[PDB]
Amino acid sequence: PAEKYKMDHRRRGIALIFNHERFFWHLTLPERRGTCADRDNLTRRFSDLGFEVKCFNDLKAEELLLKIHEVSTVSHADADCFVCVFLSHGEGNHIYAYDAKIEIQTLTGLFKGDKCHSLVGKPKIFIIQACTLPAGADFLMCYSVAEGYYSHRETVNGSWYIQDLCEMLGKYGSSLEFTELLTLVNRKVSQRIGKKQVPCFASMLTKKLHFFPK
Amino acid sequence: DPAEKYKMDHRRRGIALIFNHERFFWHLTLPERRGTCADRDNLTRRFSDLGFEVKCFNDLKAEELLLKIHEVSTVSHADADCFVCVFLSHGEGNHIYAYDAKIEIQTLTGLFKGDKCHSLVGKPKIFIIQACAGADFLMCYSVAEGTVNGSWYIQDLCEMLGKYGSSLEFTELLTLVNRKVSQRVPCFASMLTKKLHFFP
Amino acid sequence: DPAEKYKMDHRRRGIALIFNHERFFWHLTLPERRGTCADRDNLTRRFSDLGFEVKCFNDLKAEELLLKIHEVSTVSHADADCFVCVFLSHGEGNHIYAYDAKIEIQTLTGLFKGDKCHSLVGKPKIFIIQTLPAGADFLMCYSVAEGYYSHRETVNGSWYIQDLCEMLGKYGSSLEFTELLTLVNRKVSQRRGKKQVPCFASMLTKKLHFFP
Amino acid sequence: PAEKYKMDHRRRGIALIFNHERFFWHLTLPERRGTCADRDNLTRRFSDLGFEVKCFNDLKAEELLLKIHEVSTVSHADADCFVCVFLSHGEGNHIYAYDAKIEIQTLTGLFKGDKCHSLVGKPKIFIIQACVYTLPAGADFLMCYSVAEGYYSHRETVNGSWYIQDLCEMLGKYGSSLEFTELLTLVNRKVSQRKQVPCFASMLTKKLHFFPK
Known part of the structure; x- marks a missing residue:
């Protein structure tokens, strides 16, 4: 019942930050x-x-292919897990919004067990800033906002979701089980014509996730 | 605030609704x-x-379904901790069967959106779906985007429920169900903002 | 290696022994x-x-106590997760009563030190006392710390045992044991101008859960 | 059940290291x-x-009085908790060993709720390196011992002692993340495998954490 992913590898892993x-x-x-x-x-x-x-960002069309190809193919056997953060903007013309859907499909696609053996049995954590439906075993999908939900808008100090996620990460990152921590982010953001922003996370993890030190 | 829990100290735990498609x-x-x-x-x-x-109840009762669905949505949940809904279904699934289900779930979930149901605002709404949101919603799926003794998912869910139901935080327990079934891949989407325990 | 737990996956949980002084x-x-x-x-x-x-059992049965005591001591605990012993006692305590207790606890605890009891080596030995003895993997829980006020026994039991049991029922399966004992510390120390403060001394080397 | 001591004060507090x-x-x-x-x-x-x-150390007999009283009397209202580390040596002639018992009694005595109102409801953590007896206390006290009763102590090396080496090892790595007693238990296992078996006596009433600030 208290089984955890084994985080005792040489390297924690790659935290990938994709900028749309x-x-x-x-x-x-x-x-x-x-x-x-x-x-x-x-x-x-x-x-x-x-x-x-x-x-990296998708502006560098030439650079994006090499960097994307490099990460997918690199060997993750010495690593605990994989993280990917998809960042994006609020205005979102339709081509912008639509491109994003396709970029995330592909990105997530690379690491499904079939494509990436080094990560089989290891956590793949996708953190998405929206402007969804994908998965595999041991995937964790975290969304800035649930369905149809209102969004915080980007401030000069960053967005609510990323500000709070990082706030929690700094304070409780090492201590808490990850989903336990994401739930905290749910409450934090949902409390920031008026309503609320409610983040979501979809878990297909099969064990507990801690990021104790090394 | 990190260990904050939903307040489960109400007169009644709540309604566990089992919908049979x-x-x-x-x-x-x-x-x-x-x-x-x-x-x-x-x-x-x-x-x-x-x-x-x-x-x-089941949807065969076309007349009975309206009254019952109607009854539950409108009833007052102010004395209750949370709400649970289990959507059960079959494997063969002709297309009309499969399609109906999508619509039934939309509507069902729709009734309890804070907008429609004030008694449950701030309270957990837990939907457990056997396939073929809002703040404080928890969606559990028999299978992600993928028996005479029952199904694997419900058998295991119930197994875990009996053993660890009272002890464990609910999502902690669902994760166990993920591992259990994937070894015989379920999913769960959480918009809960706190911890969920079902102590006695 | 920080979240390591004692392995509680044995055929039997173990013997909970309740000694009545x-x-x-x-x-x-x-x-x-x-x-x-x-x-x-x-x-x-x-x-x-x-x-x-x-x-x-209780120490009134002087003949029965010997057979029962060594017998528990000698029995094989290889199929067991841990061992628990609860030492219960009264409030008035004339001096011979109080003194006897000290000696009974010494001896009791002594039986299970790794040297005497190989079946329990590496396994939790939990003594709940209603001091300084010990060994590796021992957990000593006291109704009251040093020189402190004690509950007094009511007709519904004592504060410490009432609260310990209260927490045990509710959180026994969920919580790490010491996490739970700390709860008992707060519970009892708030019962009511005197304060009773329980204590627990831990020589456990890992976490203790009593999952079903 | 998950209640924690309130560590959100202006200052964490004084970590006092007493050298015998x-x-x-x-x-x-x-x-x-x-x-x-x-x-x-x-x-x-x-x-x-x-x-x-x-x-400080007890060599400076004049300096010890001022420093000891000073700490006792200072106001801890802006502080989360109090820590005291008692360090000592292995050879321990009898006067040495006996003095230590008395020094610890007094030290611990200063902070009992009656003597120290600023710390009432706040953790007082005593970490003792042993050479009258072990047990003293009050509500919200945590006593950590290099070695339990009569058990073997593993001697001072040029790199420090086993207990302090391991305690500090764990502190650096898990200090901010883990509940303190959770962490001390780790120290129990660490040292007992270097038998020497450390101990800790808890009268804390809540959890614990030393998150950052």
Whole structure:
């Protein structure tokens, strides 16, 4: 009942931060400034958890192929898990929004057990900032916002979801079981014509996830 | 606040609703019929022992379904901790059968969105779906995007429920059910904002 | 390696032993007489539901005590997760009564030190006392710390055993044991201008859960 | 059930490191060199947990009075908790060993709720390296012992002692994450495998954590 994923590998793993930038036309200081806050913030938090943070964006069409191909194919046998953070903007013209759906399909697709043997039995954690339906065994999908739900909008200090996620990560990252921590993020954000933003997470993990130190 | 829990100290635990999807299904082998009864009877035992008022019905009763569905949605849940709904279904699934189910679940879940149900605002709404959101919702799926003694998922869920139901945090328990079944891949989507225990 | 737990997956959970210290107590109001049974009966319910083979005796039966004591000591615990011992006693405590108790606990605890009991080596030995003895993998729980006030026995049992059992029933299966004992510390220390503060000394090397 | 001590104060608190030196005659390089390892090591670990580490020894008989009373009387209202580490040597002539018992009595005595209102309801954590008896207490006290009763103690090396080496090892790695007693148990296993069996006596009423600030 208390079984945990075995996190005792040489390397924690790769924390991948994907930035969705292309097909977004017109970007206020806030969108531009707030995205950096999120990326820079996440990198700090995920590094302190022992991840090899790697960041890129889809603007570099040539660079994206090599980097995407490099990560998918690299061997994760010495690693505990895999993390991917998909960041995106609020305005979202339709091509922008639509591209995102396709990018996430493909991204998630690379690591399904069939494509990635090094990660079989290991946690694959996708953290999505929306502008869903995919999966495999040992996948964890975390959404900035559930269905049809209102979204926080990007501030110059980053977005609510990423701000809070990182807040919790710094404080409780090492101590708490991950889903336990995500639930905290649910409550944190949902409390930030008025209603609420309610994040979600879909778990196909089969055990507990802790990020104790090393 | 990290260990904050939903407040389960109400007069009544709540209604465990077991919905049986039967209509638009044809040629049901005895494994189908007796297996389904195993699931329903099993779930009722487990959920009652957790203090739920188990209520069962099926969609064959077209006249009975409206009144009953109607009854539950409108009833006041202010004295209750949470709400549970189990959607049971069969494997063969002709297309009308499969399609009906999608619609039944939409509607069912729809009734309890905070908007429609004030008594349950801030309280857990737990939907357990056998395949063929809002704040404080918990969706559990027999299978992700993928027997005469009942089905694997319901058999294991109930197994875990009996053993660890009172002790464990619910999602902690569901994860156990993920491992259990995947070794005979279920899923669960959580929009809960706190911990869920079903202490006595 | 931080979340390591004692392995509780044996055929039998183990023996929960309830020792009743009765001899050399002259007296015994209805409350002491009645409250002790509450504690024993209560503890038996709670410890059985955790899978223990509860065994009760008292030191009045001087002949029966020897056979029962060494017998528990000598029996093989290889199929068992752990061992529990509850030492119950009264409040008035003339000096011979109080002194006898010290000696009974020494001896009791002594039987299970790894040297005497190979079946329990590496396994939790939990003594609940109603001091300084020990060994590796021992857990000592005291009704009251040093020099502190004690509950007094009511007709419904004592504060410490009432609360311990309360927590045991509710959180016994869920919680790590020491996590649970700490709850008992807070529970009892708030019962009511005197304060009773329980204690527990841990030489456990891992976590203790009593999952079903 | 998951209630925790409130660690959200302005200051974490004072980590006090008391060094028992007097009445110890003749001290090998290892005892001398190993004690500094322990003190220096503990200071690093306890500072990173936000403590105001203060060290002194009983050699300075004049300095000890001022420093001891000073700490006792200072106001801890802006603090989460209190820590005290009692360090000592292995050879231990009888006057040395006996003095220690008395020093610990007094030390612990200062912070009992009656003497110290600023700490009422707050954790008082005493970590003792042993050479009158073990047990003293009050509500919300946590007593940690290098070694249980009569059991073997594993001697001071030039790199410090086993207990302090391991305690600090765990502190650095798990100090912020884990509930303290959860962490001390880890120290029990760590040292007992280097038998030497540490102990801890808890009268804490809540959980625990030393999250950052």
